[PDB]
Amino acid sequence: VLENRRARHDYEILETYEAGIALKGTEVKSLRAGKVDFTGSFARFEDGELYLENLYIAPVDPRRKRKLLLHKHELRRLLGKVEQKGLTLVPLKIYFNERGYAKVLLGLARGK
């Protein structure tokens, strides 16, 4: 389990959400090795899809924008809360579930 220690220590975390991550190439192997950097990463909607931006996965652009996969119920919870004054949707942790799906726990963060 890869954790964003900075987010937890410097921000107050409000609601959280879980999503899958669409990985490409060797990205999956790098994540298993724990070669990730959360610095400056955030999630934002673009053309009907939620994307995780600026997440670094050590060696394809190591910081390419990656599509997040949301189930309808989670999308419904999120819609309308992403763009709110002073809040940022940030990745809190990345892990793989039993079936091998890469997952990211997102949280609305407010300046602490």
Positions in the binding site for K ion (CB under 5 A): 9-10
State the Cα angle at 9 between 7 and 12, rounded to 5°.
70
Give dist(CA 17, CA 22) in Å, integer: 16
* Residue 8 CB, nearest approach to K ion (Å): 8
Structure tokens at 26: 């060797």
Give the nearer residue to K ion in terms of CB position, either 12 or 49: 12
* Residue 42 CB, nearest approach to K ion (Å): 17
Give the nearer residue to K ion in terms of CB position, either 10 or 46: 10
Give dist(CA 92, CA 42) in Å, integer: 10
* Residue 111 CB, nearest approach to K ion (Å): 12
